[PDB]
Scaffold this motif. Structure first.
Motif, short mmCIF file in Angstrom:
data_model
loop_
_atom_site.label_atom_id
_atom_site.label_comp_id
_atom_site.label_asym_id
_atom_site.label_seq_id
_atom_site.Cartn_x
_atom_site.Cartn_y
_atom_site.Cartn_z
N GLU A 243 -5.08 7.18 5.53
CA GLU A 243 -5.69 6.88 4.24
C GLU A 243 -4.79 6.05 3.31
O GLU A 243 -3.70 6.50 2.91
N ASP B 105 0.82 -1.20 0.00
CA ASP B 105 0.00 0.00 0.00
C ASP B 105 0.86 1.26 0.00
O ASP B 105 1.96 1.27 0.55
N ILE B 106 0.36 2.32 -0.63
CA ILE B 106 0.97 3.64 -0.49
C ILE B 106 0.04 4.48 0.40
O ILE B 106 -1.10 4.77 0.03
N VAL B 107 0.53 4.83 1.59
CA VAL B 107 -0.31 5.37 2.66
C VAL B 107 0.08 6.80 3.05
O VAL B 107 1.26 7.11 3.20
N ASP B 108 -0.93 7.66 3.20
CA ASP B 108 -0.75 9.01 3.76
C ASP B 108 -0.34 8.87 5.23
O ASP B 108 -1.10 8.32 6.03
N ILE B 109 0.86 9.35 5.57
CA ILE B 109 1.40 9.18 6.93
C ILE B 109 0.63 10.00 7.98
O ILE B 109 0.28 9.48 9.05
N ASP B 110 0.37 11.27 7.68
CA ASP B 110 -0.61 12.06 8.43
C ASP B 110 -2.00 11.65 7.94
O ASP B 110 -2.26 11.65 6.74
N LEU C 117 -4.07 4.94 -0.15
CA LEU C 117 -4.37 5.50 -1.46
C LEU C 117 -4.47 4.45 -2.57
O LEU C 117 -5.46 4.42 -3.30
N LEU C 118 -3.46 3.60 -2.68
CA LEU C 118 -3.46 2.54 -3.69
C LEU C 118 -2.93 1.22 -3.12
O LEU C 118 -1.78 1.14 -2.66
N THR C 119 -3.78 0.20 -3.14
CA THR C 119 -3.43 -1.13 -2.64
C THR C 119 -3.10 -2.11 -3.77
O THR C 119 -3.58 -1.96 -4.90
#
Ligand SMILES: [Mn+2]
Ligand SMILES: [Mn+2]
Ligand SMILES: [Mn+2]
Lengths: 735, 128, 128, 735, 128
Positions: free
Chosen positions: C62, C54-59, C64-66
């Motif tokens: 969320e 996954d590419i995840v918003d650290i703050d 974003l793309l799995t």
């Protein structure tokens, strides 16, 4: 309210004998009369040569009868496949009629008297594709029904793998063919024109004296060059030789009776350049015309002294060692592509080749890659797209692919299909003009040479208008997008473009995806979406209608026999072809020798449904509507229950399949609820047929595995044929 | 590692590519044609490429609404989370892709293509 | 790679190109600011074991793309910024107007990244 | 991969008990988990008042949970019809819960102590239309599925004939209503605003303290003049009387819970002004609020001594002599239009009246023409056009007419649907401004009077963008032209027009017919098209979305209960409403008393198909696609085989039709060839179900015709209900 | 085929102004005109640009397929002869004849496939 049911030749005829009684029984329940029209080869011979026949012997002009019937808004004609007679077939039919007390004249091959030349011309009216030009007074709506496509999905037919390293391809001309020198125009008013050749001497030879043209007609001046064609053949044979790929030739001499045998002939000439040089003098006074294939040569040398004939056959096989390998029609018998022009027919042979993974048979009897020579480029380029496409994508997957219906422009001898009597093998070098009679106006000029094939195709405005309308209708009714396959660089197809552009506006196309693309683009776009399981409608000319309605159905279904072929007749009626193929001589063989008919009648069931549905819409018959709906589910159930004819004798045959259809037909009519009269009428029929199912099938199967008497071939005796085709006592009586 | 490889280009390329042949060069080529290998209609050369299991056939993409900070992480079967890329600054209007090639699909593809090239007798090559 | 195959096919049917008669194919290429694949090097990884990538918003939290990846798989996240895309479309128009030649944007329909690009091209053409 | 299925109230819930197991069995084959969510009136009472409940008794805020889930890009919610509780419904649900051990407070109608006010205010969250505003975080895509439309053509429903001499019409205000005094504006930047009334006295009354406004929000300042409303009623009541046409009133007090009861109330006031004058003092202290209809008056006089209550009802029936005839809801029981505001509901009653030929029921039991009073002109003028159209064209023909799908702006409490907490009956003559707190700028001023109804509707910018996107999406995908129903003479709609005009350019609209017309024009344009068999999409505001999705489907199909209601949520997911009607109380009446449920679950089947299909696209689950298409073909076969639930007790019911659906769904998967695994997976199941068909059906029908035990009404026992709803053990064991 | 070409129609006055506005700043414009305007303009601009019309091409591609090549639009210049008969100096500029012949041989080469005529034309072009 009456449907005409054509009696034809060989296999479909035999099937009709078993099927007519059952259609008649169902049709009467809606007040529909079913009358036969005998347009067999035998009937057409007897209708032409009534002179030497008694009053009882004579036959009405049944073909011409139907030809008039197409001008009647109430026409309903179900056409089954019939024989397009070759000379050998005509000869066999004459001898059968003569043998049965019908004094019809011998066919004079090379007539020595002026009276023999007279009757040979009368026989020419019977030879070849005679029926279709008469009956086709509407345009083509050829497509496969949902139930058939679903069957292909459930029982996928065999397809040969397409290697990316495949060497097979379409070799076609790039100059000097009909396409690249073509002239075209739309007529501004009615004109009567002549085809003349202004020679180098100053003379003017008249090739066609008078032809009546109308306002809105599109006419073409096209020619192939003998010089370009030979050069092309020189190049492609050597190329096939150098690259080590098997040579094949794909034309349609059966229909294109003038131009295509010349083209086929030249191929053979240059291939065997060497032998035809050593025996030039002998061959000319023997009168060998290899336009009829090598078959013609072998025939005119068969009666020669052994040592002389064995020198000629040597000179042919000696010519092979520096020539490419040739594709075989029958390698076991040693019959090649060059044997007879009626053997390898372009519309069938090409799809056969593509389906097999771009392969044809060789001398050793093994499948090989081939240079499929298709001299005229006009309609062969679209084949190459598919080949290329296939190389990168692999073989088509019949389980997942879409469908490609066709809306073909064919009405009133449209385009090339009507140009036969206007095609000429140019006698000497000169300038070929089409000239208006009532004014010294030259309309289309062309510079031709000795041996060139020159021709003037015609398409009338009225068929074009109906064709556009038919395309729009199919778009509207099916929700499928339609693509018109029209080139920008072919004058004839830009002329059509002008009309398609104009006439599309005269309809409601608000929610319809309709576009116009060149053929190669159109083929690609079609392939692109079919491989993704999407459907596209091809609105094409006459020849493309032919080619495409073999190509895609063979890939999608494995045959072109299991499809709808509807012809909305312009005057208001409808014609329903049950099959685009032949009348299957091999099928008859199996029936007469060990009585198992393996002919598939699904095409007949489908056409009838279409006929009954249109009868209801045009006459306001609610009962006919219900019969059509019942037959469709019966047809659907026949496929689902897998009750189509088996090929192996001793198993379920055409007769057994017709029982199951009639069973399911009666069943559907019993459990439907929009007509109470019919529901109860067929309730005992369905009850009786189901309860005697295994006795009926028993009778229809226990009668197999024995020789049978039909009382002839080209003219079977009805009594004896009816016995053979209706052998089940139980089924006959309960009906 | 910062000196190795294509180091210069990604620093100087702060614009887009307008690459084209000058007329003088194209006109010279017309007048003086270079040698070109002839193409055989019976040629067997083809591009072999993957139909499934490559970057293309599993690709996901989005255009971003706002500026955000993302990480790249692998949530393992064990439950453990391996951080592969700790931080990357994304801007608004950035197109990002999540893109992968299956090892198993690549080896299957290779075994099939090498075998196909052999069985057909055509020469294998690899272009990367 | 599919582009190459189309030419190969085309060449098989048409023969080799003739330099003395053929036209030009200039290119307007999107490349500014380590665009697309050219910047993805620091963001490409050989997956160590089976898991979800996954590419995840650290703050915030969320995702974003799995994507579901395997051991040995290659996974990457390319980036292309908005203003480069704006510049690239403008450069296309400028080259069209100055040369008087047509321009075709080579963008797929069945590729997510190329549909995202397509949205921006369709938009920024209205700005000229 | 999770689908959220909503447990609701009454008939839809009962159907779910039989259906939930069979959807779970199919959905697991694609790796989708079907997770329940309880939003019943009972579960919403419990979730709010968890104060005196054990841990095991406590339930989560399931509505708030789902409301939160709408922000999740993977949300997949199937919304079944649910109760929008009235007071009697609330009380009954409370009383049942109390008797079952759930310690919940009584609802105090008139709070005596101040502690009762807090819990009454907490009950106000449960009352009325509370579920819809929370789940609607997207815009409306409502249309009739092709297969349903096709079925309406083949089996037309009855429609009353429209006489050219018909007298029925819409009566509506020409001044002094919301429309003719409307002021509107689009916000420049984020603001916080208050609603204040500066009185003639000098005092400033704060009606609304604070409301947060975003940039790009449209706000309106509309009011209805009480003086104008009464003078309108005086005029119309007089006109209906003078002309001899029946008086009727069509409002929506159900959802417009603040303004429309005031509108309803005044009609009753001026209609019976002679009686309301004789007993004004008595009515005042009894606390009679005729805004709740005559039912309120009749309740509060029922306890009075016989001689007095009979005098009252006599003064009411005596008032009818100088009055027009009233439309009746139940003419036998004497229940009229004025009895309850929840009887005649504009969105349903107006279509019903048009469907009947412009007829409503009289006191005599006869159908007759009516003055259909719709006081607010904004959304009523559109009805009049249809009435006029029909008057000249006759009643619509369901067998030939086109469709009118709707794309509705509703997201995030759009327009009037989120203006309830911002509507106020004005206490005294003054000026009504909406003022910014930061900088005392009056944004919209309005001069109001005592009694006048004032409100400030809100529609956010982001919803509008998605709405325009959905319009272009539907246009592209269906090929239908689309019309935005936006008035030029209405501030709110000119503000919307500015936005639509702009946001359209943000989309590729190359091959689409997309235009903007005022309401009445758009209606006419749409009618001119449907009648010629052509289709048109209506892109409309919130209230029009409601009206047209009842109106057109009633005419095209006979019901609004047989259609797709897709809500593409702005965060990425989708909500799928299965029905727009009630939860069918009477259907439960029939189930508990004689074991027959006549609830049609078609809307559930269709929504599930649209749920599974969108699962395939969003996630990439190819196995979801296969299940969707197989349900699509399963639902279609359900219609064509005519196996929807009967209304007659003893015949095929809801449970029976659920069997046939699951059968066809199983068959469709077994006989398809786009997924090999799923095919052989359902193969034995499909073979099983079909084999004991008239055994399962025999069980499901035999058990009917008797009283049954589900263990409650508002909270039925899961164990008892499941026994009743799954009474076929042959069927149950098969899974 | 006009795809890459700038072609428009303007009234005489406007077209003249438009034409002047471009030529005052080094830009070229073709004037497609009627018979009298052809005459008027092929004197006007050639006088202003070059001083004379005796230094230009006047090519007439003949409708039947041939080609006429006017060497000059001017007169036969009597005063040139006066100088030649009295002082033996012909000041006549034959540059119009050299260019016309150059255009004649070039069309000859392209029309009849004569390569040697093409080489004569180019050698004359460079000689001029
Ligand atoms: Mn054919
Ligand atoms: Mn509604
Ligand atoms: Mn001059």
């Amino acid at each position: 309210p009456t449907i005409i049911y054509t009696l034809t030749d060989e296999a479909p005829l035999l099937a009709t004998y078993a099927f007519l009684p059952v259609v008649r029984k169902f049709a009467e329940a809606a007040g529909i009369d079913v009358k036969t029209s005998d347009i067999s080869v035998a009937a057409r011979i007897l209708a032409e040569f009534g002179d030497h026949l008694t009053e009882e012997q004579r036959v009405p002009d049944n073909l011409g009868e139907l030809g008039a019937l197409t001008q009647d808004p109430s026409a309903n004609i179900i056409k089954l496949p019939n024989i397009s007679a070759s000379v050998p077939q005509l000869l066999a039919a004459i001898k059968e009629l003569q043998g049965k007390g019908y004094n019809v004249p011998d066919y004079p091959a090379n007539p020595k008297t002026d009276d023999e030349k007279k009757i040979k011309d009368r026989y020419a009216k019977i030879l070849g594709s005679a029926v279709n030009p008469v009956l086709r007074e509407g345009n083509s709506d050829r497509r496969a029904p949902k139930a058939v496509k679903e069957y292909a999905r459930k029982h996928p037919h065999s397809m040969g793998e397409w290697s990316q390293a495949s060497r097979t391809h379409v070799a076609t001309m790039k100059t000097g063919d009909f396409y690249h020198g073509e002239k075209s125009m739309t007529l501004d008013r009615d004109r009567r024109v002549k085809m003349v050749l202004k020679t180098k001497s100053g003379e003017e030879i008249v090739l066609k004296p008078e032809v009546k043209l109308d306002a809105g007609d599109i006419i073409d001046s096209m020619y192939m060059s003998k010089k370009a064609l030979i050069a092309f053949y020189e190049e492609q044979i050597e190329d096939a030789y150098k690259t080590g790929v098997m040579f094949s030739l794909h034309v349609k001499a059966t229909m294109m009776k003038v131009s295509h045998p010349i083209v086929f002939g030249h191929a053979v000439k240059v291939f065997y350049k060497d032998a035809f040089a050593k025996h030039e003098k002998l061959f000319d006074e023997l009168g060998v015309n290899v336009n009829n294939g090598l078959s013609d040569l072998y025939d005119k040398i068969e009666a020669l002294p052994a040592s002389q004939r064995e020198e000629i056959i040597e000179d042919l096989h000696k010519c092979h060692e520096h020539r490419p390998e040739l594709a075989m029609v029958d390698s076991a018998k040693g019959i090649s592509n060059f044997h007879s022009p009626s053997d390898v027919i372009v519309d069938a042979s090409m799809p056969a080749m593509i389906r097999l993974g771009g392969k044809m048979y060789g001398a050793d009897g093994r499948t090989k890659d081939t240079k499929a020579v298709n001299p005229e480029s006009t309609f062969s380029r679209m084949y190459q797209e598919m080949i290329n496409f296939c190389k990168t994508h692999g073989q088509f997957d019949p389980t997942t692919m879409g469908t490609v219906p066709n809306v073909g422009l064919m009405a009133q001898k449209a385009e090339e299909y009507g140009s036969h009597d206007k095609t000429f093998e140019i006698p000497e070098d000169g300038v070929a003009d089409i000239v208006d009679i009532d004014t010294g106006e030259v309309l289309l000029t062309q510079n031709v040479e000795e041996g060139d094939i020159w021709r003037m195709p015609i398409v009338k405005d009225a068929p074009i208008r109906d064709w556009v309308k038919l395309a729009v209708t199919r778009a509207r009714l099916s929700g499928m997008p339609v693509v018109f396959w029209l080139d920008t660089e072919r004058p004839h197809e830009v002329e059509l473009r002008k009309k398609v552009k104009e006439y599309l506006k005269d309809h409601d196309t608000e929610g319809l995806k309709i576009q116009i693309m060149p053929q190669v683009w159109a083929m690609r776009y079609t392939l692109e979406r079919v491989v993704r399981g999407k459907d596209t409608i091809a609105a094409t000319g006459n020849i493309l209608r032919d080619y495409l309605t073999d190509l895609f159905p063979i890939l999608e279904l494995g045959t072109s026999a299991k499809m709808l072929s509807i012809v909305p007749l312009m005057a208001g009626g409808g014609l329903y072809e049950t099959g685009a193929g032949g009348s299957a001589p091999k099928h008859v063989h199996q029936l007469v020798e060990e009585n198992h008919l393996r002919w598939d009648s699904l095409g007949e069931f489908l056409a009838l449904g279409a006929s009954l549905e249109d009868m209801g819409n045009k006459t306001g018959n609610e009962k006919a509507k219900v019969l059509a709906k019942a037959l469709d589910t019966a047809t659907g159930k026949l496929l689902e229950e897998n009750k189509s004819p088996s090929r192996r004798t001793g198993e379920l045959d055409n007769r057994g399949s017709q029982f199951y259809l009639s069973l399911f037909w009666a069943q559907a009519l019993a459990e439907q609820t929009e007509d109470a009269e019919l529901a109860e009428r067929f309730k005992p029929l369905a009850k009786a047929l189901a309860e005697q199912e295994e006795a009926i099938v028993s009778e229809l199967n226990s009668v197999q595995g024995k020789t049978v008497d039909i009382g002839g071939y080209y003219y079977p005796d009805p009594e004896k044929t009816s016995e053979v085709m209706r052998p089940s006592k139980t089924f006959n009586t309960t009906l």
